């Protein structure tokens, strides 16, 4: 029985990435409603599936410490290209320090909240895992979504490894979710109505869009074109589209709007629609408001306010 590593337990299996806590705070990012695959299995030691490998992540004030679980290879530390993966996943080329400052210069309200909530950045997620994760997110909470994605992976995705009493499965491919008994199984796993959307969307991306290459096209396509493309999918509206756009298709300006963004905007910015009334048009107006205020990284600024308003 292999067990979840800690930094003091076999430090001969950890590689480091020079990362200030001001740049990245794992405890405000990993289980804060972006990915649902990260668990604090032991204190300050976050374990989760990236691609087809398990990771455990921990950090000091100066460094990001990480180790990978590949029975397969000989027990060893993360390779160079595997460290490059984490660097990209956390989008560390981008300075959060400078973005925080740029947003603070125009938003008095962000200045106060951001003081207490440093190191909140956007993960760069796999489009497929991101799409189905957020189809599961409708009228749902982070704990229930975490449960539905785990069961989904254990039932459809391949087994990678077991660490303690935790079995880790990779995210299933479209074809595994598109099958004739997929909806019926996903309903047994407790997804309710979200079971129809998951199977249906898996089918639509294969037959009607030409499989996962389509999601890579959207990643390169402009924001507005990708958003409209996503909205053609079963169970994917403006909100889920903007979530995927922001977190998986490199559209930092994407601002997902629901009744909770409405609440923040109204209470904290005194925002009202300059129309009639939450409608599709007014939700779009709210998204424009924040883009006009914070600029082309409005979505990353939203991740800081959301992550804060969750504590």
Annotated binding site: 139, 144, 194, 256, 258, 260, 277, 302, 306
Beta carbon nearer to its own copies, 159 or 272: 272
Footprint on residues 99-118 left by its own copies (CB under 8 A): 105, 108-109, 111
Q: List the single partner that 173 binds among ligand SEQ, its own copies, none, CB under 5 to 8 Å by kind.
A: none
Beta carbon nearer to its own copies, 1 or 274: 274
Footprint on residues 124-163 left by its own copies (CB under 8 A): 139, 141
Residues of each annotated binding site for 8-oxoguanine: 256, 258, 302, 306
Out of 114, 258, 283, 298, point to the residue binding ligand SEQ (CB under 6 A).
Answer: 258
Which range in 156-164, 169-177, 255-263, 295-303 contacts its own copies by CB under 8 A?
Answer: 255-263
Site string for ligand SEQ, 98-137 (x = CB under 6 A): ---------------------------------------x
Q: What is the nearest approach in angstroms of ligand SEQ to the Cβ of residue 181?
A: 27
> What's the Rg (C-alpha) of the chain?
20
Footprint on residues 289-308 left by ligand SEQ (CB under 6 A): 302-303, 306
Phi, psi of 221 (to 5 degrees): -65, 155
Site string for its own copies, 257-296 (x = CB under 8 A): --xx-xx--xxxxx-x-x--x-------------------
The catalytic residues are 239
Out of 145, 152, 244, 245, point to the residue binding ligand SEQ (CB under 6 A).
Answer: 145
Q: Which residues here bind ligand SEQ, judged by CB under 6 A?
A: 32-34, 137, 140, 142, 145, 243, 246, 256, 258, 260-261, 302-303, 306
């Amino acid at each position: 029985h292999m067990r979840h590593r800690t930094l003091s337990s076999s430090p001969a299996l950890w590689a480091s990435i020079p990362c200030p806590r001001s740049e990245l705070r794992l405890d405000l990012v990993l289980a804060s409603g972006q990915s649902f695959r990260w668990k604090e299995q032991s204190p300050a030691h976050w374990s989760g599936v990236l691609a087809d490998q398990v990771w455990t992540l921990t950090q000091t004030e100066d460094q990001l410490y990480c180790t990978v679980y590949r029975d397969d290879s000989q027990v060893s530390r993360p390779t160079l290209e595997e460290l490059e993966t984490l660097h990209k996943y956390f989008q560390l080329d981008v300075s959060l320090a400078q973005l925080y400052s740029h947003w603070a210069s125009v938003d008095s309200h962000f200045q106060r909240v951001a003081q207490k909530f440093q190191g909140v950045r956007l993960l760069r997620q796999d489009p497929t895992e991101c799409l189905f994760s957020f189809i599961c997110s409708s009228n749902n909470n982070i704990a229930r979504i975490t449960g539905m994605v785990e069961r989904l992976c254990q039932a459809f995705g391949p087994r990678l490894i077991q660490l303690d009493d935790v079995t880790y499965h990779g995210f299933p491919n479209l074809h595994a979710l598109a099958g004739p008994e997929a909806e019926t199984h996903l309903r047994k796993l407790g997804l309710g109505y979200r079971a129809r959307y998951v199977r249906a969307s898996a089918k639509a991306i294969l037959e009607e869009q030409g499989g996962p290459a389509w999601l890579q096209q959207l990643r390169v396509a402009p924001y507005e074109e990708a958003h409209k493309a996503l909205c053609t999918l079963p169970g994917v509206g403006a909100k889920v589209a903007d979530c995927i756009c922001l977190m998986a298709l490199d559209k930092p300006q994407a601002v997902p709007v629901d009744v909770h963004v409405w609440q923040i905007a109204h209470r904290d910015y005194g925002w009202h629609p300059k129309t009639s009334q939450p409608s599709p048009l007014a939700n779009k107006e709210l998204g424009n408001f924040f883009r006009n205020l914070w600029g082309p990284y409005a979505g990353w600024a939203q991740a800081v306010l959301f992550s804060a308003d969750l504590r």
